[PDB]
Paper text:
For structure determination, we purified endogenous SIFI by immunoprecipitating its largest subunit, UBR4, and then performing size-exclusion chromatography. Having ensured that SIFI was active, we used single-particle cryo-EM to resolve a partial C-terminal map of UBR4 and associated proteins to an overall resolution of 3.1 Å. The C-terminal interface is centred on extended interactions between helical repeats from each protomer that are cemented by horizontal coiled-coils at the inner side of the scaffold. Calmodulin docks onto the outer rim of the scaffold, close to a hinge around UBR4 Gly4301 that connects the C-terminal dimer interface to the catalytic module of UBR4. Calmodulin’s N-lobe forms a bundle with two helices of the UBR4 scaffold. The N-lobe is not bound to calcium, and calcium-binding residues are not required for UBR4 recognition. By engaging two distinct regions of UBR4, calmodulin creates an intramolecular bridge that stabilizes the UBR4 lid to anchor KCMF1 to the scaffold. Following an unresolved linker that is predicted to adopt a flexible conformation and of which mutation impacted neither SIFI binding nor substrate degradation, KCMF1 is further anchored above the C-terminal UBR4 dimer interface through a helix that is enclosed by the UBR4 lid. The UBR4 lid engages the KCMF1 helix through extensive van der Waals and polar interactions, including a group of Trp residues that encircle the conserved Phe319 of KCMF1.
Numbering used by the authors:
A (entry chain A): 3302 to 3337, 3385 to 3522
B (entry chain B): 3468 to 3522
C (entry chain E): 287 to 331
D (entry chain C): 5 to 148
E (entry chain B): 3745 to 3799
F (entry chain A): 3857 to 4031, 4044 to 4298
G (entry chain B): 3911 to 3965
The structure:
Amino acid sequence: YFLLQVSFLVDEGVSPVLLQLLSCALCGSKVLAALAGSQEDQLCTALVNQLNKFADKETLIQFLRCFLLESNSSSVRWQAHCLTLHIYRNSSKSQQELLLDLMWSIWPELPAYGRKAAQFVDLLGYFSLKTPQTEKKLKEYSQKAVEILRTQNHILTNHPNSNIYNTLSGLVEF
Amino acid sequence: FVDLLGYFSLKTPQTEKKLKEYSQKAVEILRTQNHILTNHPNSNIYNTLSGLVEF
Amino acid sequence: QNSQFLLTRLNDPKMSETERQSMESERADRSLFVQELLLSTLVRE
Amino acid sequence: LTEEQIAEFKEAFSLFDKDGDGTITTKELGTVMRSLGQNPTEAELQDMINEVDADGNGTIDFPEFLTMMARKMKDTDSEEEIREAFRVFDKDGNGYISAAELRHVMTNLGEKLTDEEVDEMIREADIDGDGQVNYEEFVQMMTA
Amino acid sequence: KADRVYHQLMGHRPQLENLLCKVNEAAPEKPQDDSGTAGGISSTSASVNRYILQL
Amino acid sequence: RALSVLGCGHTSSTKCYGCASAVTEHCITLLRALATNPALRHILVSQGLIRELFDYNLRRGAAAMREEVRQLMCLLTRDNPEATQQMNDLIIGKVSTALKGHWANPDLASSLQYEMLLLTDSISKEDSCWELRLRCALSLFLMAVNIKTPVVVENITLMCLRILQKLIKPPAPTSTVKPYCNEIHAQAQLWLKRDPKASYDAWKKCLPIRGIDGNGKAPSKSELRHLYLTEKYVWRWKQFLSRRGKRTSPLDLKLGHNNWLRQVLFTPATQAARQAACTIVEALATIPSRKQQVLDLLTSYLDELSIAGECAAEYLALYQKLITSAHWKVYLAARGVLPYVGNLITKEIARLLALEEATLSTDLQQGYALKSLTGLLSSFVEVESIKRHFKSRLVGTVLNGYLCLRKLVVQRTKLIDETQDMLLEMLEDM
Amino acid sequence: DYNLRRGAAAMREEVRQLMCLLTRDNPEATQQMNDLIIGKVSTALKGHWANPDLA
Ligand SMILES: [Ca+2]
Ligand SMILES: [Ca+2]
């Protein structure tokens, strides 16, 4: 837990090495983390359960936005993608639902991160269709997604130079 | 040719009947040419190229 | 390559042999229906 | 039959006249009939092709083809075959056709109708509403 | 000879129609940095849509 | 987390059209992910996602994003009658309104370009809802064919013809009902009007199952006559029940000879439409009786070949392909195709003569209609029986045509020379 | 319907001048052109966001 908590006060240069240590812990993409039998997987599940026992929702939210969203380095973003995917996979039902809810809570803040959010959205979508979930929260997630879509569509439609960008995209390759 | 026609058509005092006849002839030729251009096999191509590429 | 993105990898083709035969029969029947539809479209009023 | 017609029959008959393997002549003559302006159902075609087996390749003469068409002509009506129809439609001997043998005929043709449809058909055919249909009603429908 | 050159001229017609449809899509195809730079492609020309340029 | 709260990573600026479009792309990706789950798909359709995607996301963004939006809409309507009916209605409204004043507003080139690609990709998605999609396609096709404007043809009629062609000639199978010989049991006017009487289910119920003919070693001579009688008088039973009015009226296999069929077979706007129509007619020629009917249609359209010149190459290829068997050549000859083609050749040669004494207008295809008509006549003559029966009737027209072609000196084109050579060969053969 | 949008720009301005002349001191004529423009604008506004071909 302390390695993650430290990964908060480190530079984006130190972030990848801590993320790769966390990946060797969650038996994630250690090789990919570096580039960017049954008892072993049992240890992996024990470690993710220990982390979920320690990691409160606030710190979970924090690193999830810090590395999946604010990384600015696609390589660190992919490491966080693999790490969170294995965290969710190796977690039980309650922590799975809680993680899905946290990422759907971050979902409205997406417009502030632009392209960087790509990997994040991936996990969200996958998780939203992988966890058996109640109809109420399914409707809530769908409403959040369509609300963000409507907001962005209205922003693009009423954007001061939307006409200029549309016409230029039509003509000159920019 | 058209020049003279137009000038003469507006220079000679002429009866209402033949004025209407001349107007009908002019508008009929305009309608025929407009329909020809609209239904022309490669009218779309020429319109789009005139829009984009100088030629 | 493109396998990093889970969402893109999602699409799973799967199609069975007896259901192959049923689907092919459905395609043939739909084609016949469209043929009759166009032929009835051509019928003189 | 006016000569105008027999001449047209001979014209197409001579045009399609051809020989070879199987019974081409039968196929050629079925195409003549359709060319003449009368299109028989696939079943009618098969029946007539069989109804002519005198020589190899189903040899058909113009008089022979005239005989063939003279039997049905425009197929407008055939009370003789309508009685034979009642004979067939009524699987068990003759007298009164029933919904059972009616649906039997339908399946033999290859058509599948819900008993409800069979009931509609029999209600339409029956006139005295005795649950039975005789020539009196079979012929009535065939001439309705 | 005219028959032959006729085929060549009308042979481009389909390709020109394809280019027209592609430009009408008005897709934002960012200038592709082709490895082959033998052709004299200016920055402004590279900026101009390739479909537009192909047309 | 205190340092992260103070400052961490980087954020986009306000009114970021570029990042705003990136977030829109992320929304499209997420919705394409969610739409996979049927319950989520229904919920998103109930939200109003289809209309939002149609109005805003169909035309903006990178082309890959546009195709992803089209796939997302197809997924929402997949196996969803309410969603698919709604999408089809939106498509009709946007396309139909553009047809109005298409000459006044020629933007159609790009206006429906995306709506019709949505219809095409939807048709590609195979579902039970296919019926409503095919309905929309047929309606748009007929409306645009009623229009001769190339812009309208090349967009609407071309994509509609491609949809109909991919439906009629299905992607080749990799691993059940036969039509009535003399009747069309489907209706178009009723089906487009959403009438439950005419539908794929009702139609498919109407025709008999193909089943198995069997009788491989069984002559069944008696059974053949029996089945003949039962079929004839069962069809009579249905026909009488329908004239009384208690059953739906079937349609008679009869054509007007001036239908959208010719309108497309000959379209100078593009050969694409002509090729699609040729494929559609070739696939309509599956059944021999329907072969007869389409052959009559084409031999009636024969005049439009002379009218259109080289634009009728595809129709010519289709027509020669359909009559490649001497069987149908003899059938058409019996109907009187040979005098018709002879008169057409004579009229074309007279028109050339009339132009011979007129202005010296050079034409590259000059004689394509003449050469093609003479090739058709030679193809018919290449059958012995037709030659025997029509030598005395064709000698006069071939002599007149050859003599009138020999008069040509200034307008004599290579195609005219080939036609004259073919006429000489036919005359020598006659 | 036809001559406003097709032809060289000088021809388009001549067509506009011709329409203005036709609608001079003619309450019926001026009303017709005004209503045509109104309808065009309305149908374009019906879906300006939906169809960006308004311009
Ligand atoms: Ca009985
Ligand atoms: Ca009775």
